[PDB]
Amino acid sequence: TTAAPLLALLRENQDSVKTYALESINNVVDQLWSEISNELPDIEALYDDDTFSDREMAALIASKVYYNLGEYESAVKYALAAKDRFDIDEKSQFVETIVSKSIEMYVQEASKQYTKDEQFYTKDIIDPKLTSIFERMIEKCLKASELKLALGIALEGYRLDIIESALKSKLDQDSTSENVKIINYLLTLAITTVTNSKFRSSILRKSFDFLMNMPNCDYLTLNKVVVNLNDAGL
Amino acid sequence: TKKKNEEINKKSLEEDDEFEDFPIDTDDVEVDDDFTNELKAELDRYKRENQ
Amino acid sequence: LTKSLSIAFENGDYAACEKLLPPIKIELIKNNLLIPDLSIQNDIYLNDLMITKRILEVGALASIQTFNFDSFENYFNQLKPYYFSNNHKLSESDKKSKLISLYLLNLLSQNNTTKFHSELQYLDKHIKNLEDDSLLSYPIKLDRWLMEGSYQKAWDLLQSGSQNISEFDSFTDILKSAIRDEIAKNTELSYDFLPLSNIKALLFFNNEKETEKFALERNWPIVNSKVYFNNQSKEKADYEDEMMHEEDQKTNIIEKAMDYAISIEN
Amino acid sequence: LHHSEKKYAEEDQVQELLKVLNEISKTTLTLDPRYIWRSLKDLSSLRNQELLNAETLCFTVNVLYPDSSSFKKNLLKFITSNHKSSVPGSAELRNSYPASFYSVNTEKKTIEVTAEINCFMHLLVQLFLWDSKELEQLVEFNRKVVIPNLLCYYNLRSLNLINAKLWFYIYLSHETLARSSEEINSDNQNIILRSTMMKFLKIASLKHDNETKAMLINLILRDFLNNGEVDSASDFISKLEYPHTDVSSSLEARYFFYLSKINAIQLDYSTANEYIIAAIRKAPHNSKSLGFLQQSNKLHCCIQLLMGDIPELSFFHQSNMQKSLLPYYHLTKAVKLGDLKKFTSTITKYKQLLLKDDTYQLCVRLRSNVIKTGIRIISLTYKKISLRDICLKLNLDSEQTVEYMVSRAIRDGVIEAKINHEDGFIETTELLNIYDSEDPQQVFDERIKFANQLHDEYLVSMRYPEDKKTQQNEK
């Protein structure tokens, strides 16, 4: 069995014949991710031109070829370059790999930019499409309704908007007893992992506001914040 | 157990009995050169002599 | 329509085969869908598949005679996995033997022996043994005598090809020109100067003028109807030797010393 | 009779099971379960012969049955069923202990203990199947269960260590089914076989478990080789991630075997040398391992003859693999003497033996070599030899033919001569002396670099043992 017929039909000018070939390629990559590499630049040129009309499919295939080889970097840029064909990725739970790879790339970038200005998501430099994949991975944990995998992921990646909004939806005040808990776990975590001034300070300050908004609050928790931030203003 | 690993993996290339399949199916080279030489030396001699 | 093509071959216009092929290539999607693509084989599908093979096949032969390589090869890619299927479907044909023969001759004309032998290894089991060698004997022996070093034998096969031409000449021509080059290269080191008669005889040229054509292209002085190989070839060699590859692979004597010393001292 | 023997067998398994169960559940003691699992497999195989081998039947009967039950019933069905205590759960003697498995909690689904036990049970089943020569239904059934059984779970470093054995039997068993008999089904399922191996490999890159990578890659090469698909193997090898560091030396030797084979046929001989020499040294000299060795020597004989070397006769003189290697030996002879008529007779007579091993195709190609060695000989002997004399001796066709052999031979420079057409003779030009040249430097570079590498390996190895005993109590 061999992918070489498939490769050959693509050159033919006729669009109907090239498109049917893509679809055939997509279901042999699993193994043939080797022969196809020699001819992989043809698949790339058909996407790069706007001339083509089945563009998203062509990028998708080039990505799968890079993924199997393991040349991860190109795999992720080509996933994000099709823009659609992502529902395909989601209905494989054996490729959440590239999604994670995208998490890796994000976390590094965001963290750097955070210091200049806490916001940078919207920023042109940080490609919007990548921003959204980051939130999607997090959204899966939130379908399953565990807030601890969700915060976890956000923390590393220096994402303050997300942490605000998570905490708030479960600060509906079911009781004092529960409100009180949520805050305290967030202090212990923030202290011994993040030691960077600016990021830690920000987390703590939020935790202050939440208890403060609320007319009735334990004071035990409130003393801790005040001392640690050594912030007379609170 | 390092040794045991070797023999087992190897077995598939050896299959049933790549050891006994084959026999079930089926200057030291050079000959006595004294004789050749004896005769050469007399065959030379004869002609030499009667010339 | 599969019979429109069919008759196009018998008519003997292979230019007619060419212009009709592109509408059928959209149709050849539809033929593919008729077979479940070998998920299960039945006898209805044995019939369906017979038509598909026949179509691709008449298209292949056409491309060699119209000298368009690209199309021939692509079709050929397909054709192989088409023929190899299971143990025997209705893969066995008179055309089967014929098509293999051609493919191998092609690979020899590309002067790419790497793939030739690779393709040969694929054949060497079932098919080569059952069909014996009777059209296969033409590429096996050709490739074999060129390896052996007996050029005379490799040349005579090319000449005797005349009784069988139908599409084989499209390779015969390319292959010859490469053979004279081969001879010229071996005989370069052998001897610098050859009488006029012998340069011709070796390379099996019909005419002396053709000989001097090959000299000029080869950048060799003709001086008193005697070729001289030594000069340019040596210069060229020298120039070729200097590139950004073979500089790290030279290894300097001073560089060897350093590496021996520091390995002890790490 | 039945009762005693069956019982002892069950005990023996239970003992083994308990050891590895304590081991695997504590941190990253990885090496320990791995060494243990290997020894065990050997012990079990050796066991089967005496005091029954219905250990499997027992061993199912007293563990939690997730799908074990379904397999066991199939196996019994195969060798004509019997019932005497052959449904699992028929003896309750786990009794909700933690060691024999907490009976209730496995049922509640709060915890899973069956996972690793089921991988280990599949290994044991698989070994018995091959030892026995239980083919057809069992083989198919075993494969059908185990592939989705593994894709049902999620791998761990410890689970990765276990499937490094399981994948060898999935392959091997299928091959056996092709090897019984020709089926139209065997051609289809060959494809499926490749497909499941290929998927598991991709994931296993992500687990960074070298053990499984190495195993898998060897299996995958062997299949391409049977179909003579060199073009597809060539790209496959360019992937480059086949680990060596962690792997057992067996996997390095099968890998190198395959490398020699694939390089030689596509007309590369130089590098093919390094690989076959290496593959012989890595292989052990074990009594069961003698079959491998013959095979490696057949191939070596060939590689060398093509390259233009003469394997020592001496090496084959004191070997005992004699009867099998008779064909090869006669080839060596034909080349060494340059004798034209001998060569041809040798390959016609032995054709069938040579075909089995697939050395044959290499052997046709030595035809160019016979002639060349024979021209090598005439040159060493003679400084001016008329070309007319060479044409009679090697019974060459015409004056043009004799020239062309020498012409092409000097291109690789094996003979190094000069032909004089007009004077009608060959004059040797051979340097002979290469001490004067730069060459002596190059030869010594390899010698020195190999040597230095051996000192480094020693240093690193030496300290490790001594730490272990020093920690331990001693005088």
UniProtKB/Swiss-Prot annotation, chain A:
Transmembrane residue ranges: none
Q: What GO biological process terms are annotated to this protein in UniProt?
A: proteasome assembly; proteasome-mediated ubiquitin-dependent protein catabolic process; regulation of protein catabolic process; ubiquitin-dependent protein catabolic process
Keyword Transcription among record annotations: no
User: What's a Gene Ontology MF term here?
Assistant: enzyme regulator activity
GO cellular component term of the entry, any: nucleus
Which post-translational modifications are recorded for this protein? N-acetylated by NAT1.
Which UniProt keyword terms apply here?
Acetylation, Phosphoprotein, Proteasome, Repeat
Function in brief: Acts as a regulatory subunit of the 26S proteasome which is involved in the ATP-dependent degradation of ubiquitinated proteins.
UniProt miscellaneous comment: Present with 4750 molecules/cell in log phase SD medium.
Q: How does it assemble?
A: Interacts with UBR1.
Protein family membership: Belongs to the proteasome subunit S1 family.
Q: What is this protein called?
A: 26S proteasome regulatory subunit RPN2
Please give the organism: Saccharomyces cerevisiae (strain ATCC 204508 / S288c) (Baker's yeast)
Q: Which residues of the full protein are shown?
A: 4 to 237 of 945
UniProtKB/Swiss-Prot annotation, chain B:
Gene Ontology cellular-component annotations: cytosol; proteasome complex; proteasome regulatory particle, lid subcomplex; proteasome storage granule; transcription export complex 2
Q: Does the keyword Transcription regulation apply?
A: no
Key words of the record: Acetylation, Phosphoprotein, Proteasome, Transcription
Give start-end of the signal peptide.
Answer: none
Listed under GO biological process in this entry are: double-strand break repair via homologous recombination; filamentous growth; maintenance of DNA trinucleotide repeats; mRNA export from nucleus; positive regulation of transcription by RNA polymerase II; proteasome assembly; proteasome-mediated ubiquitin-dependent protein catabolic process; regulation of cell cycle
- Give additional notes from the record: Present with 5590 molecules/cell in log phase SD medium.
Q: Which family does it belong to?
A: Belongs to the DSS1/SEM1 family.
Function (record text) = Versatile protein that might stabilize multiple protein complexes involved in diverse pathways. Subunit of the 26S proteasome which plays a role in ubiquitin-dependent proteolysis. Also associates with the TREX-2 complex that is required for transcription-coupled mRNA export, and the COP9 signalosome, which is involved in deneddylation.
Q: In its UniProt entry, what is this protein called?
A: 26S proteasome complex subunit SEM1
What is the scientific name of the source organism?
Saccharomyces cerevisiae (strain ATCC 204508 / S288c) (Baker's yeast)
Q: What is the lineage of its organism?
A: Eukaryota, Fungi, Dikarya, Ascomycota, Saccharomycotina
Swiss-Prot record, chain C:
Other remarks on record? Answer: Present with 9890 molecules/cell in log phase SD medium.
UniProt cross-references to PROSITE patterns, sorted A to Z: PCI
**UniProt organism field:** Saccharomyces cerevisiae (strain ATCC 204508 / S288c)
- Its domain of life? Eukaryota
Family assignment from sequence similarity: Belongs to the proteasome subunit S14 family.
- The UniProt record lists the PCI domain at 70-245
Q: Which GO terms describe its cellular component?
A: nucleus; proteasome complex; proteasome regulatory particle, lid subcomplex; proteasome storage granule
Q: InterPro entries from the xrefs?
A: 26S_Psome_Rpn12, CSN8_PSD8_EIF3K, PCI_dom
Q: What does this protein do?
A: Acts as a regulatory subunit of the 26S proteasome which is involved in the ATP-dependent degradation of ubiquitinated proteins. Necessary for activation of the CDC28 kinase.
Record key words, sorted: Proteasome
GO BP of this protein: proteasome-mediated ubiquitin-dependent protein catabolic process; ubiquitin-dependent protein catabolic process
Which Pfam families does this chain map to?
CSN8_PSD8_EIF3K
Q: What is this protein called?
A: 26S proteasome regulatory subunit RPN12
Curated annotation (Swiss-Prot), chain D:
The protein here is known as 26S proteasome regulatory subunit RPN3
UniProt superkingdom? Eukaryota
Q: Where is the composition biased (Basic and acidic residues)?
A: 463-475
Question: Which PANTHER family does the UniProt record give?
Answer: 26S PROTEASOME NON-ATPASE REGULATORY SUBUNIT 3, 26S PROTEASOME NON-ATPASE REGULATORY SUBUNIT 3/COP9 SIGNALOSOME COMPLEX SUBUNIT 3
One Pfam family name is PCI
Q: What does this protein do?
A: Acts as a regulatory subunit of the 26S proteasome which is involved in the ATP-dependent degradation of ubiquitinated proteins.
The family line of this record is: Belongs to the proteasome subunit S3 family.
Record's subunit section: The 26S proteasome is composed of a core protease, known as the 20S proteasome, capped at one or both ends by the 19S regulatory complex (RC). The RC is composed of at least 18 different subunits in two subcomplexes, the base and the lid, which form the portions proximal and distal to the 20S proteolytic core, respectively.
Q: What else is known?
A: Present with 16700 molecules/cell in log phase SD medium.
**Which biological process annotations from GO are given for this protein?**
proteasome-mediated ubiquitin-dependent protein catabolic process; regulation of protein catabolic process; ubiquitin-dependent protein catabolic process
Molecular-function annotations in GO: enzyme regulator activity
Question: Is Acetylation among this UniProt entry's keywords?
Answer: yes
Q: Does the keyword Disulfide bond apply?
A: no
Q: Which gene encodes it?
A: RPN3
The record's annotation in SMART domains points to: PAM, PINT
Q: Which residues carry this modification: Phosphoserine?
A: 437
